[PDB]
């Protein structure tokens, strides 16, 4: 039935580019979870660095310091930088964002910026001067203290609504994942039928 | 009054801005839907225009003369064309051409060199549908028209009706050309049209978590 081998032809190609896609997802919520697990140790260097600046060592600090340098420059498989927008302390590369086909005519953002979520109008050099009060206290010493605390929960802030948007983004992919799961098996059903 | 419950009035301040997210993408996919199936119309309406044309090849390919009687044949398919070309050159109420890629005030058709030549192309326009989420929102008159060659079938519709006005030794060879000419448009609309409506499946997946996601937010702010 030549007309059924076509049929056929279609559907292994039509086959092939769903498996395409799903790669393109997966490849993406691994790339989404693992800048997931670097927010999150930002994180926890920030609410360490607040507890320091709360009770209170002068060591503690710029440990904490270092586990968030890291992490905003910290790099891949091949050795492209994750947080720096499309240039894969002063800020080290943009805002831009990197695309992803994920369904035909969808396409997915697949990164948050240390630009974006640094700025907060640099906590990184807020903690410079502070940890300079703290070798000789001055007399703004105290005006230190809370500019640090209130960059330390400004940059919380921004960290945690971050993945809050990648989990959002995790639904999305799901989503899309689930439609060509459902699409591939009714191609593996009718290829089966003919 | 707002000073009461100071974290709580953040917290539903938050709900509201986030609230206003998702009907905003809502509204963008509504729209998005509302566009798509209008140059769907427009495809439908091709395709219609490349059955009658094609169903006039079919009969008109004449083993047996009648030589003058194919003269309402070449008005026919002179209507068909037109219609055709009508079609790709759609504008919306704004007066924007449909078809044409960005080229959104250049019609996607020009006829004005002696043949069809395709002025539109074949740029994508995007719309947002969810934070990070973009649909495209468009289709090509010069992505649909490629059948290769570069040689659309309105060109060679023309050259059929005038192997029609005088025949030549190659009259069956133009009839073979533009039947396949005609059956490879219509592969490139219907497949386009199949390609909208996977277009409006997406979209309706993303809606769908967007009213969930729009429940858990009235009830956490109802609650409150
Ligand atoms: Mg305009």
Same mark, same amino acid.
């Given at each position: 039935?030549?007309?059924?081998?076509?049929?056929?032809?279609?559907?292994?190609?039509?086959?092939?580019?769903?498996?395409?896609?799903?790669?393109?997802?997966?490849?993406?919520?691994?790339?989404?979870?693992?800048?997931?697990?670097?927010?999150?140790?930002?994180?926890?260097?920030?609410?360490?660095?607040?507890?320091?600046?709360?009770?209170?060592?002068?060591?503690?600090?710029?440990?904490?310091?270092?586990?968030?340098?890291?992490?905003?420059?910290?790099?891949?498989?091949?050795?492209?930088?994750?947080?720096?927008?499309?240039?894969?302390?002063?800020?080290?590369?943009?805002?831009?964002?990197?695309?992803?086909?994920?369904?035909?005519?969808?396409?997915?953002?697949?990164?948050?910026?240390?630009? @974006? *979520?640094?700025?907060?109008? +640099?906590? %990184?050099?807020?903690? !410079?001067?502070?940890?300079? =009060?703290?070798?000789?206290?001055?007399?703004?010493?105290?005006?230190?203290?809370?500019?640090?605390?209130?960059?330390?929960?400004?940059?919380?802030?921004?960290?945690?609504?971050?993945?809050? @948007? *990648?989990?959002?983004?995790? +639904?999305? %992919?799901?989503?899309? !994942?689930?439609?060509?799961? =459902?699409?591939?098996?009714?191609?593996?059903?009718?290829?089966?039928?003919?």
């Amino acid at each position: 039935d030549p007309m059924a081998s076509i049929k056929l032809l279609n559907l292994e190609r039509e086959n092939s580019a769903i498996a395409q896609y799903q790669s393109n997802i997966a490849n993406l919520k691994t790339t989404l979870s693992s800048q997931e697990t670097h927010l999150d140790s930002v994180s926890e260097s920030l609410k360490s660095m607040r507890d320091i600046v709360l009770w209170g060592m002068i060591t503690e600090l710029k440990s904490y310091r270092d586990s968030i340098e890291s992490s905003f420059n910290a790099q891949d498989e091949e050795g492209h930088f994750l947080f720096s927008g499309t240039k894969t302390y002063v800020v080290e590369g943009n805002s831009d964002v990197r695309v992803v086909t994920v369904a035909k005519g969808v396409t997915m953002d697949s990164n948050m910026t240390a630009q @974006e *979520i640094l700025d907060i109008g +640099n906590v %990184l050099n807020q903690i !410079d001067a502070l940890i300079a =009060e703290f070798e000789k206290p001055s007399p703004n010493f105290q005006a230190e203290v809370d500019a640090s605390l209130n960059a330390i929960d400004d940059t919380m802030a921004n960290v945690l609504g971050a993945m809050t @948007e *990648i989990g959002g983004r995790h +639904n999305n %992919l799901d989503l899309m !994942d689930g439609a060509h799961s =459902e699409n591939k098996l009714f191609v593996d059903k009718v290829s089966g039928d003919l």
